């Protein structure tokens, strides 16, 4: 039912040839590739075993990045949105680029079993021949059935040898807490690789009780599989979905990623006009038309600049449509996107014209 190809193979201010045809909002949606971990967490009465699956969920967010070091996602323009209603996975995702200077992406997804949301700001920085990626923002998951509210941070990424001998790495510590239950917390270390070994991508984690005693260990590789151990017992709690055959020909997308930008002709009229699916530069890139992709990308950046200039001449601050700024200065859904969609009410908002 959903596509498993693009019209054209991937090519063998940034030139479009370096882009993949997804943007930052869509990469947020990719963090729900393994949302079945939350469905399973919502069925585990014990908060300590449940924390294991949330941790695996947090780790699973990194898997897809393994094959994608060669490509850069599009920067959404200010006011761009992206939705993703997945009956199959039982969630409704939507997102919005709420700031461009600096770039901030916000997202929110509802399921009968969980609510997932975050806002993220990425700081890039080139260091010699390599690029350091430093995210700011917190990820949240609630599991209503238990009153759980988990929160955790992202770690640092590095893209090395920025040649075809390039590779991405993640390292740092994730700390996961449940704000409604201090009975346990979790710390996960993404181990930085060593020059003497090919062995990389390793994860070492522990679920601690409130006193700091170790109850479960977590270990494995963030692009492969993760195991849980807990006194004489051990189990695989997660593994990566296999890449589709010939996946390299389409930006090395997972099957999930390949589905994200697809325009479904039956549900098209349900979308607000800021949805990424309408963005023409990404669509030309999918079609292998690099020249027109580049023209459209430059044009879209120009439109964004002119719009920003007008706003500051009129002393007007940009106002996101589906997210509001909390006291945290974090961005959260204002509870209107899915309600307006359902009610066919997108016309009732004044949408910036982005392309």
Please give the distance of CA 154 from its chain centroid, rounded to a whole number: 11
Nearest to 271 by CA among 351, 201, 326: 351
Q: What is the resolution of this structure in A?
A: 2.1
- What would the two tokens of residue 22 be? 């997804």
DSSP secondary-structure letter at 155?
A: -
Backbone φ and ψ of 179, nearest 5°: -70, -15
Query: How many whole angstroms separate alpha carbon 49 and alpha carbon 26?
Result: 30
Query: How many whole angstroms separate alpha carbon 325 and alpha carbon 30?
Result: 23
CB within 8 Å of 28: residues ≥ 6 apart = 95, 105, 107, 118, 120
The SS3 assignment for 158 reads strand
Range of the domain at 292: 1-355
- Give, in order, the Cα–Cα distances in Å from 26 to each of 75, 185, 258: 10, 29, 11
| Burial class, 266, CB count within 10 angstroms (exposed 0-12 / middle 13-18 / buried 19+) | exposed
- The three-point CA angle 322-32-148 to 5° equals 80
Q: What is the DSSP string of 14-59?
A: --GGGEEEEEHHHHHHHTTTTTHHHHHHTT---HHHHHHHHHHHHH
Query: How many whole angstroms separate alpha carbon 228 and alpha carbon 217?
Result: 6
Q: Tell me if 39 sits within 8 A of 202, measured CB to CB.
A: no
- What would the two tokens of residue 64 be? 């897809």
Query: How many whole angstroms separate alpha carbon 29 and alpha carbon 33?
Result: 8
Which residue is listed with tokens 């998951």? 141
Q: Tell me if 56 sits within 8 A of 316, measured CB to CB.
A: no
State the CATH number of the domain containing residue 21. Answer: 2.40.160.120
Q: Which H helix or E strand runs over 97? A: strand 91-99
- Going by their DSSP bridges, the two strands 138-143 and 130-136 should be labelled as unpaired
CB within 8 Å of 176: residues ≥ 6 apart = 51, 54, 55, 58, 150, 151, 152, 185, 186, 187, 188
The SS3 assignment for 285 reads helix
Please give the distance of CA 327 from its chain centroid, rounded to a whole number: 23
**Residue 70: how many CA atoms within 13 Å on its side-chain side?**
14
Please give the distance of CA 66 from its chain centroid, rounded to a whole number: 14
Which residue is listed with tokens 């209107």? 336
Q: How many domains does the chain have?
A: 1
Nearest to 336 by CA among 27, 147, 108: 108
Nearest to 256 by CA among 20, 6, 24, 33: 33
Taking the alpha carbons of 32, 301, 297, 248 in that order, is the dihedral positive or negative?
negative
């Amino acid at each position: 039912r959903r596509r498993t190809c693009l019209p054209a193979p991937c090519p063998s201010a940034m030139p479009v040839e370096l882009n993949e045809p997804l943007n930052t909002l869509q990469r947020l949606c990719e963090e729900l590739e393994y949302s079945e971990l939350l469905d399973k967490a919502a069925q585990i009465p014990s908060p300590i075993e449940r924390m294991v699956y949330v941790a695996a969920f947090a780790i699973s967010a990194y898997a897809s990045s393994y094959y994608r070091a060669g490509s850069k996602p599009f920067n959404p323009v200010l006011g761009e949105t992206y939705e993703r209603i997945r009956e199959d996975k039982g969630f409704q995702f939507f997102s919005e680029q709420v700031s461009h200077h600096p770039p901030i992406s916000a997202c929110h997804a509802e399921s009968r079993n969980f609510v997932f949301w975050q806002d993220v700001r990425w700081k890039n920085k080139f260091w010699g021949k390599s690029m350091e990626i430093v995210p700011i923002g917190t990820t949240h998951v609630t599991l209503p059935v238990f009153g759980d509210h988990f929160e955790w941070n992202k770690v640092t990424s590095c893209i090395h040898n920025i040649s075809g001998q390039r590779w991405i790495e993640h390292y740092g510590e994730i700390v996961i807490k449940n704000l409604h239950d201090d009975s346990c917390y979790c710390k996960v270390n993404f181990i930085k690789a060593k020059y003497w070994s090919t062995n990389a991508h390793e994860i070492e984690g522990t679920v601690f009780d409130r006193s700091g005693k170790a109850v479960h260990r977590l270990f494995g590789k963030w692009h492969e599989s993760i195991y849980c151990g807990g006194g004489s017992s051990s189990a695989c709690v997660w593994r990566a979905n296999p890449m589709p055959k010939g996946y390299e020909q389409y930006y090395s997308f997972t099957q999930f990623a390949l589905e994200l930008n697809e325009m479904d002709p039956s549900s098209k009229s349900l979308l607000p006009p800021t949805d990424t699916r309408f963005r023409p530069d990404q669509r030309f890139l999918e079609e292998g038309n690099l020249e027109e992709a580049e023209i459209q990308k430059q044009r879209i950046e120009q439109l964004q600049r002119e719009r920003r200039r007008v706003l500051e001449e009129n002393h007007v601050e940009h106002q996101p449509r589906f997210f509001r700024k909390s006291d945290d200065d974090s961005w959260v859904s204002n509870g209107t996107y899915l309600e307006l969609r359902k009610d066919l009410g997108f016309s009732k908002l004044d949408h910036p014209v982005l392309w």
